[PDB]
Amino acid sequence: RTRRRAYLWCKEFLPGAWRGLREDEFHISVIRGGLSNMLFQCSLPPRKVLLRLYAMVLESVMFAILAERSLGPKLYGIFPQGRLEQFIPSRRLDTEELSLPDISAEIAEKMATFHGMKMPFNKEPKWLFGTMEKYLKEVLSRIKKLHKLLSYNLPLELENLRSLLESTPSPVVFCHNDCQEGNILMLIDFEYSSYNYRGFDIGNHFCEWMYDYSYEKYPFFRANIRKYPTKKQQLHFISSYLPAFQNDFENLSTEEKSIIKEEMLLEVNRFALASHFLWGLWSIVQAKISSIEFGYMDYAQARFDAYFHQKRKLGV
Amino acid sequence: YLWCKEFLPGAWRGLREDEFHISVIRNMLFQCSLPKVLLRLMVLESVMFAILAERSLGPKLYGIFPQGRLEQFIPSRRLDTEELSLPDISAEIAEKMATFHGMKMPFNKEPKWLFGTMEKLSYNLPLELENLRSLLESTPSPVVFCHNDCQEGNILLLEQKLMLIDFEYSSYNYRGFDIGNHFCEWMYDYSYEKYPFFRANIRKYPTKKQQLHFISSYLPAFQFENLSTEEKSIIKEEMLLEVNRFALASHFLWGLWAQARFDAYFHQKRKLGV
């Protein structure tokens, strides 16, 4: 029987009707069936709950806290396999919805709210170039494809970037770091969340207009470089973002306002380069150490070609 | 620090060593301050500490990472044993311990922690835990979010005079245990300079009157407690059985891996009827 454990958690953690409720009447339905996150719609007929099984205290102290602040589902029980999580009738929102004005703004301000937070995690801005440096080292028909990636001269370019981004001031704030369409229901899943350059969070969100992972045929993803936010679009994100992040912002002069936004367009767009390089690196390492399923070298090539395309567009 | 400078905001990022001074206090406790925070050197306790922190009924939480934590330094002395009997303190601890109980928490609601922990000289035991289980296996006591460690040296008289800290042991448990365990603490002084570091007295244990002025403060801060005076007495009487029998749990379990807490457990065994 599929419900093998399941019943045992829901009876034990959820109070009231779940307290006595016999096994003959435990109704569970699968929602997502993953190798490192299975989802389940356990209920009774808190009437329904979301079971989510399969160094990191981060994305569980995080989840808790957002459940305290009404900005995430409630935490109805936690245990070393997963958690029982409030069910909210909801769905992942697909890549094509991100450009909507309705949804875009919201995300911009929610990401501003997120960056606003002050949290009990390491504040040393290590995550970005510490991870990238580790992966580049690690890296050094597949055998074939890797060469074409490595022929780009990744070690050099990585310091070319270190240079470029070190010239680009970006405030250090608690970033989500994976703010793409499949993590917005409300903004969820903090696997890779940490303190980081705000630039990365945004630019990585922009990069994310290009890639759709809703896929069951290899390579399991689609890339549309002609789908990155336009200038007007970017600005508009930033201008739903700034007033949600700086209380002082709305009363600045237009030269002040305009100067910021001008400077922030440069910021997030140079950081978008980091998103291509980080994830490009990440993907290659997964083409080896992955029990998941995806087209990781293809994804790599996609991320890298963007990266070189990207930096031609910027001209520096 | 590292650790401190790694996690704290402001001047802390700019600090160096030597330029920072900690100060040992008790695994270990520490006391770090600028040229102040508590340094305590897994996931499940972190989730716990933070939620409590978030409900502003704990010290502030600044850092949390695998082998430890960084907390609000809360200017105060800790109470000593003799203060506990004070009608005013005892009452406040009863109102505090009550809310701490009425909190929803994301953990196991089947009391396993109690029996489980005990499982985990000439005193030949386990067959004693067997009565101790069966007996308490009867006693109905509503489950709640228990502190599991209400000693004087865990209650701060800060400079509503007090709040409670140090919840390393804060499981879900039978209400009887928490309340009862606190009562057992009136009997144990963890002062005394000489060996064996403590003094004890079965007479300092709260009387019928004392533990009642206590449990009549706790029920309002829990419970509408408009209910008839006769319904309140039945609630009180009710709870005494539970409180005092579950005080045997207190004694016994407190054979932390010397301290003849047993001598008392056998005592309240005669005194109880069972």
Ligand SMILES: Nc1ncnc2c1ncn2[C@@H]1O[C@H](COP(=O)(O)OP(=O)(O)O)[C@@H](O)[C@H]1O
């Ligand atoms: N609290 C919740 N209540 C109801 N449905 C949820 C909840 N969280 C996630 N889901 C469902 O799961 C999908 C997203 O799952 P997600 O957690 O992003 O995947 P993964 O399990 O691989 O990390 C959405 O389509 C949504 O319907």
